């Protein structure tokens, strides 16, 4: 984006009684993920882990243990309610990382700033046999 939005760790959360699909001991020790978005009204939405919850008008914040749990929610909000979520990654040390709209534009739209990675300039197939690379790793690279 213009600039990465820093994390506001104190924002209101949705109205959700709780469930058993929440966070486990891995979260405090290794890492966990949090997602933010801004809603115009009070609505109901399905959580990835558990049941239904009620959003809040204004900013909202959740905490998840997996990136798929977060991106599963973005696909729901972008489609059903047509919003623009953004989620981070929090380590146990307190470090924070801004992941998904890393360029500000979603990945399915091009942008001039991006640089290609893992781009082979050949056709699928048309690559050396494993015997040529028998004693080190990799036939595709």
């Amino acid at each position: 984006p213009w600039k990465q939005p820093e994390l506001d760790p104190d924002t209101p959360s949705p109205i959700f009684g709780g469930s058993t699909g929440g966070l486990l001991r891995k979260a405090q020790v290794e890492e966990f993920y949090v997602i933010t978005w801004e809603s115009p009204k009070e609505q109901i939405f399905e959580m990835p882990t558990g049941g239904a919850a009620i959003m809040r008008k204004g900013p909202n914040l959740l905490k998840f243990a997996r990136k798929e749990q977060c991106m599963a929610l973005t696909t729901q909000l972008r489609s059903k309610f047509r919003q623009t979520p953004c989620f981070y990654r929090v380590y146990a040390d307190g470090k924070v990382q801004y992941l998904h709209p890393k360029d500000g534009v979603y990945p399915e739209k091009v942008n001039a700033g991006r640089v290609g990675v893992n781009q082979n300039m050949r056709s699928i197939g048309k690559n050396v046999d494993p015997i040529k690379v028998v004693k080190f790793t990799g036939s595709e690279p």
Binding site: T20, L24, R25, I124, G125, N127, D129, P130, I131, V134, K135, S139, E140
Partner: protein
């Protein structure tokens, strides 16, 4: 923990522990590997398997001599039962030790089934002292090999790569010394020791120098009168231990069996391993090694190219392919060893080589099934290790136009013409059994389609069997083949084959016909599954590049309609089910045809083996009576251990169905639920795993479930085979 692989050590789950064991002895995929270090690590490991063999043999000798009845068995071999090892189970009760002490020994014991008693007794062992002395000998030889695997790994004594890739020297030394000289010495043992021990003379290390094998000595050998050693053979009325009816011969060509011990003449087997030593020493001097004379291997392959071009370039480019590919060399060895292992099974039951083995009915069975089940496992590895060659060690540009590329080019024809034979035998064989099952059921047993195997009966007539009346050359006195070998082998051979109380060329009927064709269904379709996994290992239309992934991977995903079980590992996986089915038919047919012979009622097999209810009624249901009553509510016999094992295999077989039917995704969601409970529990949460728990992988479950499958397939039949035959004693 895996030091050879850093990729798995970083894995936090339990997949590290499982995959660390399975990839242990796969040296090629290890980290920091080199072609030179590979051969050295193999050469050292192959010393290890020898160390376990010589120790495994030493354990049988000691545990037999210390706890067995070898001294008592020789005096009355027929009636006395052999003893393998004693029993100490404190969870027994008093009725069990009274039942398991059937042997002459004080405590309970296990009756042997291998047949080592008949083997050791034949080669001249008649005491327990001689077995103690031998068990020490192999344990020394075992330790020597362990010292060599360590010694030949050191900085010095470390063979170079050129030393391993010297094929011409390996053939000459191994064909001449390992095969020939060893066969020459074994003849030296049978002559200097065993034949005297049969004829009463006690020969040992004390007196083998003073005692002559022949009265004349070696003066016939130098003079050229080599027929003096075949002058006075042993008579028919000859006891195997005593000198009553003995002779002076050491090399003879009598042919046939010995009358008392329905076994081959020792003087023949002595004469046998001599001639084998001569051909193998002669073949050893063939290839070229550090002298001007000799053949070269590469020059031969390049030459045998047909001019017209039916094979293209021919056998060119193959020498560097075989010599550099270890998987190629391993496929040919297993395919050769796996076939030989079947010969050992087919040629021993018909030609008993040991004394008092034909009478031990339980022992003949296990030796047949043991080798044949091994022959299937080995032979399924040849194709599997042959498929890995196409992925890892195959170079198309080097092997261009040769036979190996021309096979891989038209593989669609091979796999297709194979599928015809499997389908053909499958429809028409089953249709006849089902045609006979029904028409028996409606009370009309004469409408069955019973076809006589004329082509096989034509052979037995051409090999001395006068029952069928074809009157072929060797069943005809006027032919030259009868005239030749009339003085040599035929009087002893014709007497045995025409005797219908031995397993030498048994009578054949229409029931034997259907099974030999049903066996053909197994080999042709089992080969189809393994051939396909090999030729389509490099690529398929569904997966044009399998070679990039590897031999074993789960799948390529649900896309393209589904890609489950495509890899060559999954072809080997499915063939083992057919290997076991095929060997089961082969082995069921051996047991029942022999039981009817031993029970005297051969008509049981001929009339009932034509329809499938006979197999379920007369073979399985009937012979499972004494076994199933091993532990009754009234009491328990000595067969209780077999009935327990008989269920133990019916259970292990079923547990594999879990890993085969139920797949991973059901379980990983379940383990996630137990993880939640372990953390939310008040006191158990204080304990925490070091490695994260996850369900078993996809490929692991196919392996695990196949092990639980095959072990029940084997433990179930072993109990039935031994219990059915032992309880009836015939």
């Amino acid at each position: 923990f895996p030091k050879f692989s850093q990729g798995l050590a970083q894995d936090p789950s339990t997949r590290r522990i499982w995959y660390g064991l399975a990839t242990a002895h796969d040296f090629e995929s290890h980290d920091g590997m080199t072609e030179e270090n590979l051969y050295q690590k193999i050469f050292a490991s192959h010393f290890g398997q020898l160390a376990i063999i010589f120790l495994w043999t030493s354990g049988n000798l000691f545990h037999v001599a210390w706890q067995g009845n070898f001294e008592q068995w020789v005096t009355d071999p027929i009636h006395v039962r052999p003893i393998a090892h004693a029993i100490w189970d404190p969870h027994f009760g008093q009725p069990a030790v009274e039942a398991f002490t059937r042997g002459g020994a004080s405590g309970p014991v296990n009756i042997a089934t291998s047949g080592v008693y008949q083997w050791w007794y034949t080669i001249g062992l008649r005491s327990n002292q001689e077995l103690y002395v031998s068990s020490v000998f192999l344990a020394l030889v075992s330790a020597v090999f362990l010292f060599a695997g360590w010694l030949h790994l050191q900085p010095n004594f470390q063979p170079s790569l050129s030393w391993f890739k010297d094929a011409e020297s390996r053939l000459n030394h191994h064909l001449a010394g390992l095969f020939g000289v060893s066969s020459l010495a074994w003849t030296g043992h049978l002559v200097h020791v065993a034949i005297p021990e049969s004829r009463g003379q006690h020969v040992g290390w004390d007196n083998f120098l003073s005692v002559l094998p022949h009265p004349q000595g070696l003066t016939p050998f130098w003079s050229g009168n080599w027929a003096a050693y075949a002058q006075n053979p042993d008579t028919a009325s000859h006891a195997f231990g005593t000198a009553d009816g003995s002779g002076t011969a050491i090399l003879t060509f009598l042919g046939g069996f010995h009358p008392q011990t329905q076994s081959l003449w020792l003087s023949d087997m002595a004469h046998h391993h001599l001639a084998i030593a001569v051909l193998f020493i002669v073949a050893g001097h063939m290839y070229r090694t550090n002298f001007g004379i000799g053949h070269r291997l590469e020059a031969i392959l390049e030459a045998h190219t047909p001019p017209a071009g039916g094979l293209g370039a021919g056998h060119k480019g193959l020498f560097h392919t075989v010599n550099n590919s270890l998987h190629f060399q391993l496929g040919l060895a297993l395919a050769s060893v796996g076939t030989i292992t079947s010969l050992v099974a087919q040629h021993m039951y018909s030609l008993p080589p040991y004394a008092y083995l034909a009478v031990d009915f339980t022992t003949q069975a296990s030796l047949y099934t043991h080798h044949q089940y091994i022959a299937g496992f080995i032979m399924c590895g040849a194709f599997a290790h042959g498929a890995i060659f196409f992925i890892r060690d195959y170079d198309p540009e080097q092997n261009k136009g040769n036979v190996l590329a021309r096979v891989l080019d038209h593989k669609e024809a091979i796999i297709s013409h194979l599928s015809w034979v499997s389908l053909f035998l499958g429809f028409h064989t089953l249709g006849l059994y089902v045609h006979n099952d029904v028409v028996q059921a409606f009370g009309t047993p004469e409408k069955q389609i019973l076809i006589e195997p004329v082509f096989a009966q034509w052979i037995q007539a051409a090999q001395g069997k006068s029952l069928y009346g074809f009157d072929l050359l060797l069943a005809s006195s006027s032919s030259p083949a009868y005239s030749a070998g009339q003085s040599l082998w035929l009087p002893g051979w014709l007497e045995a084959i025409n005797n219908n109380q031995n397993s030498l060329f048994l009578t054949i009927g229409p029931g034997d016909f259907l099974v030999h064709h049903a066996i053909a269904l197994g080999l042709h379709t089992t080969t189809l599954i393994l051939v396909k996994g090999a030729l389509d290992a490099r690529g398929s239309k569904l997966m044009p590049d399998k070679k990039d992934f590897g031999y074993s991977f789960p799948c390529d995903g649900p896309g393209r309609g589904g890609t489950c079980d495509i890899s060559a590992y999954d072809a080997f996986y499915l063939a083992v089910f057919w290997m076991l089915n095929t060997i089961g038919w082969v082995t069921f047919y051996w047991h029942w045809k022999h039981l009817t012979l031993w029970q005297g009622n051969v008509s049981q097999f001929d009339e009932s083996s034509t329809y499938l209810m006979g197999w379920l009624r007369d073979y399985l249901w009937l012979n499972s009576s004494q076994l199933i009553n091993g532990y009754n509510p009234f009491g328990m016999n000595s067969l209780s251990v077999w009935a327990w094992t008989f269920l133990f295999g019916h259970l292990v077989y079923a547990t594999g169905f879990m890993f085969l039917i139920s797949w991973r995704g059901y379980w990983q969601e379940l383990i996630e639920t137990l993880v939640w409970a372990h953390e939310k529990t008040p006191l158990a949460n204080l304990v925490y795993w070091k490695d994260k728990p996850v369900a078993l992988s996809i490929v692991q479950a196919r392996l695990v479930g196949l092990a639980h499958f095959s072990v029940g397939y084997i433990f179930t039949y072993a109990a039935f085979l031994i219990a059915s035959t032992a309880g009836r004693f015939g």
